[PDB]
């Protein structure tokens, strides 16, 4: 049962308060003890931080809820770890059995096909696509309007630049870059 | 008139249920003689295998029915082929005029704008773009995130590769390669 | 409040068509005096036309509205110019803080992140992502699937081919362009 205030730890956290706003909350708390215990959001995009933040705030007994969409379509067959400060941002798709793991940022129009495992604390940036069977591994950063082949697996602390499309499996941690815009 | 229950002939069946569990239908009865005659859908990815199933199920008097996800958006004036076997997954647009002929599959995010052809039996994957007045030949691949600029014509049994970018008509089937990521 | 009848000045029209009827408009009026003041809307992807075009028909008295599509999702602390000729397509989403200046058009499946401005008279293609605080000078086009990494400026009349990237600050204007797909 979500409480109709939320504490939102975090731009990026304007942005969480229009998707808890979109959910139903009434009013978002931003924070930058004996506080209300109301659901909490972390609205940090660096992986590192938000892991550190989730762990302190946890401990000190507060739910750290997902923060989903109306328009982010998932899989009823799908798996998003439940009450794991998950951002789902509007027009994302999560196809079957695809599973999504704690503290996992989804942006605007990313999609993940079925039987993906997207790792703790990953973020796949606007416009990533993520194609089927794909293994993306704890704390890698996908860029906007980048792209995995089927059937791929991406290692822990791994960087895919914007635009840049993954073609080969990935078993060591690395930075994978695209093509840069060249003036003419 | 659709049926309440639906054969799904064929990971992408389980993605194909949901389409169809989204329009309406009750039941989903995975396939891969003497039964009742409930609506078909041929979930196979592949051109090939799809077309000749197609034949085979089509003489065997099934009616196979279009799955297309209510998140579609479809012009007016766009024209679908009706029951037949199309493929058309959520938030795909299809703008004024285009035209989808037998067998497509239009992934997820997928956009076909004005006046595009795209041929019988072509994979449309997930996030590419045809932009207007673009011709897609019979049984072509359209790789992930990848596009076709305005006014081009991709022949029949061609390949676009995931993030790639057509920028020239191409009267002769090839293949199209984009530039894979490159670890540093 | 808007009038039932829209006028349309300018394929691109039939388009315009399908979002002002989205919108609630039960007619349009193809153009290309003493006519009744319905809402007018200018369907010129050509931004330099549409400009003056614009300027025309405000010198008339006419009220040149924007044409925003149902599904186009903004942000209520974004800025949007009201009665200033934008189009703004089907899966649009426009995030926290970010402006839109007159005769924008953002295509099918753009993104405008938080904080962005994008300026006058551009034209935003199919699948284009600007990134957060991102700046957009006026008279520019982004091609299809194209986008702009964070924190970046893009000097007036400049060109971003389809498919490309930018990574870098540009305070000149330029053209600058991607890798096209290549024929094996």
Chains 1, 2, 3 share one sequence.
């Not at 591994?137 to 309007?145: E, H, Q, T």
């Not at 822990?156 to 930075?175: F, H, P, R």
């Amino acid at each position: 049962a979500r409480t109709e205030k939320i504490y939102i730890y975090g731009g990026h956290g304007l942005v969480c308060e229009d998707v808890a706003k979109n959910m139903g909350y009434k009013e978002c708390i931003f924070l930058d003890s004996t506080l209300p215990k109301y659901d909490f959001f972390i609205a940090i995009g660096n992986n590192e931080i938000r892991k550190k933040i989730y762990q302190k705030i946890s401990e000190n007994g507060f739910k750290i809820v997902n923060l989903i969409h109306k328009s982010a379509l998932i899989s009823p067959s799908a798996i998003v770890e439940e009450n794991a400060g998950i951002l789902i941002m509007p027009y994302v798709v999560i196809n079957a059995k695809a599973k999504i793991e704690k503290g996992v940022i989804l942006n605007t129009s990313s999609v993940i096909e079925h039987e993906c495992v997207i790792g703790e604390f990953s973020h796949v940036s606007v416009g990533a696509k993520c194609a089927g069977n794909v293994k993306i591994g704890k704390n890698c950063f996908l860029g906007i309007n980048s792209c995995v082949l089927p059937n791929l697996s991406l290692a822990d602390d791994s960087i895919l630049g914007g635009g840049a499309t993954l073609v080969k499996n990935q078993d060591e941690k690395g930075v994978f870059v695209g093509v840069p815009a060249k003036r003419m």
